[PDB]
Design a protein around this ligand. Structure first.
Ligand code: NAG
Lengths: 109, 183, 197
């Protein structure tokens, strides 16, 4: 999908006022070295979506967490045409996602 | 305990304190040596200043003599942002009895500004906040002298939780109906 | 034959769950067999039905997305009498402040007013605008209001009558570019006494 048509202003308000708090809330201060970066709002949203809604080995439940469902709903609402478990892995992925949001916030449209 | 501060998205300053050495890179290119160490008289390092890039991941590797890792990090440089203070603050009495506080913008987004004031006569500071580049402070007495100061504060959702506010500006003193020599 | 109604939400009420409360504008209404149902913008389910308690309907839930709008419908059996579309995030009623206290400071010739602001400790919506109101405890007066974004303010002594008793109370409203809504209930009132001039 091409995230270039998303309303970034709306998504930003949702991230700043809800999703950000959900992420920091889940991380409880844990952080990990950052693996990837991104340099535009559309490119960051693409990575965010991919990290957030695709399960990974060690944290199958990730796409079902509240911050993930809210991310899905925010993209759905504001992007036209948008379609066991180890806690340390969950945290690692959650930390990556939060930092991709920071990149989103710092990137141009 | 190692500290990292990114000064105004211009430089990154890493401070420690054996003789440590620092390598760094942006992205996945080749590690590079610290471009400028802070050295003691005996020639042991105390820190490093390097350039900040607004994008890309800054990897830091601090090693002991012998090549052992003592500190590692990998985040955007802005993760450690401390903005410069605002350059010059202006205070303007409006006819309403309000004061408009204004300042020049920083060269990057995502900052809130905190404006404090109190009577120039060790009382508590009152604070108000807002985005660039002005805000209004109401209810001031036209004949009393007030101190104002401002700082820039990186928004947590924008830059994250390791960013920190600038230093306060030097005080700017206001006199509603009085001359400056009344303050 | 008017089933017009209001709703307000409250975030993080007795834990992580949020509260939705609705009621009819007209209290003289036969609510016989009427139900409130909310559909849309929920996490795991299509709809929820509110629970009736005397003259109000409420649901405490974890299901709200807080993103996008919901349809709230007054139903009689399967008949929709009236449905309104609204977003939970734009009908938020703040929690009232508490621990209101007033201390006379002679050296400052003023009264220091302090209270506790519960939103500061919450997950979402941490910043509210406060409204402090005061007037003499006896007799009729227009309340004096003070608008604040922090949990203290001062009243100069000279502003008040001497040797009198004042009543004071405080309320809050969301102040957020996403969450919007309504004034809290007033805090309980405190009273304080003013000195000789
Ligand atoms: C300490 O390490 C720095 C960085 O590698 C180097 O420039 C300096 O010569 C060293 N000093 C001593 C006394 O080994």
């Amino acid at each position: 999908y091409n995230f270039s048509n998303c309303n970034f202003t709306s998504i930003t308000k949702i991230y700043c006022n809800i999703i950000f708090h959900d992420l920091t809330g889940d991380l409880k201060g844990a952080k990990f070295e950052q693996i990837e970066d991104c340099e535009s709002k559309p490119a960051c949203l693409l990575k965010i979506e991919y990290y957030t809604l695709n399960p990974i080995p060690g944290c199958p439940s990730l796409p079902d967490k509240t911050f993930a469902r809210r991310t899905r709903e925010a993209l759905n609402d504001h992007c036209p045409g948008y379609p066991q478990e180890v806690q340390n892995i969950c945290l690692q992925q959650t930390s990556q996602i939060l930092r991709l949001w920071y990149s989103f916030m710092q990137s141009p449209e | 305990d190692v500290t990292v501060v990114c000064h105004d998205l211009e430089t990154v300053e890493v401070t420690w304190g054996a003789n440590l050495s620092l390598e760094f890179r942006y992205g996945t290119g080749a590690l590079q040596p610290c471009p400028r160490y802070f050295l003691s008289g005996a020639g042991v390092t105390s820190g490093c200043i390097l350039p900040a890039a607004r994008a890309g991941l800054l990897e830091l590797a601090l090693r002991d003599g012998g090549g052992a890792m003592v500190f590692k990090a990998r985040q955007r440089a802005s993760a450690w942002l401390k903005p410069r203070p605002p350059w010059q603050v202006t205070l303007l009495w409006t006819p309403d009895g309000d004061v408009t506080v204004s300042w020049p913008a920083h060269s990057y987004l995502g900052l809130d500004y905190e404006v404090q004031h109190r009577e120039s006569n060790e009382d508590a500071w009152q604070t108000t906040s807002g985005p660039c580049c002005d805000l209004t402070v109401g209810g001031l007495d036209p004949v009393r002298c007030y101190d104002f100061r401002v700082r820039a504060s990186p928004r947590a959702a924008h830059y994250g939780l390791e960013a920190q506010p600038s230093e306060w500006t030097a005080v700017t003193r206001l006199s509603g109906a009085a001359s400056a020599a009344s303050c | 034959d008017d089933h017009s109604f209001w709703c307000h939400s409250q975030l993080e009420v007795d834990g992580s769950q949020h509260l939705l409360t609705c009621a009819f504008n007209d209290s003289d209404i036969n609510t016989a067999n009427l139900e409130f149902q909310i559909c849309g913008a929920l996490l795991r389910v299509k709809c929820l039905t509110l629970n009736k308690l005397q003259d109000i309907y409420f649901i405490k839930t974890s299901e709200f997305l807080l993103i996008g709008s919901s349809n709230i419908c007054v139903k009689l059996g399967q008949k929709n009498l009236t449905c309104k579309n609204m977003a939970i995030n734009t009908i938020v009623k703040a929690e009232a402040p508490s621990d209101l206290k007033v201390v006379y400071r002679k050296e400052a010739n003023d009264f220091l007013v302090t209270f506790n602001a519960p939103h500061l400790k919450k997950k979402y919506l941490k910043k509210v605008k406060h409204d402090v109101a005061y007037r003499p405890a006896r007799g009729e007066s227009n309340w004096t209001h003070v608008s604040l974004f922090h949990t203290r303010t001062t009243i100069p002594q000279r502003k008040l009558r001497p040797k009198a008793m004042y009543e004071i109370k405080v309320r809050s409203i969301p102040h957020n570019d996403y969450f919007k809504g309504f004034w809290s209930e007033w805090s309980p009132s405190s009273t304080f006494e003013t000195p000789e001039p």
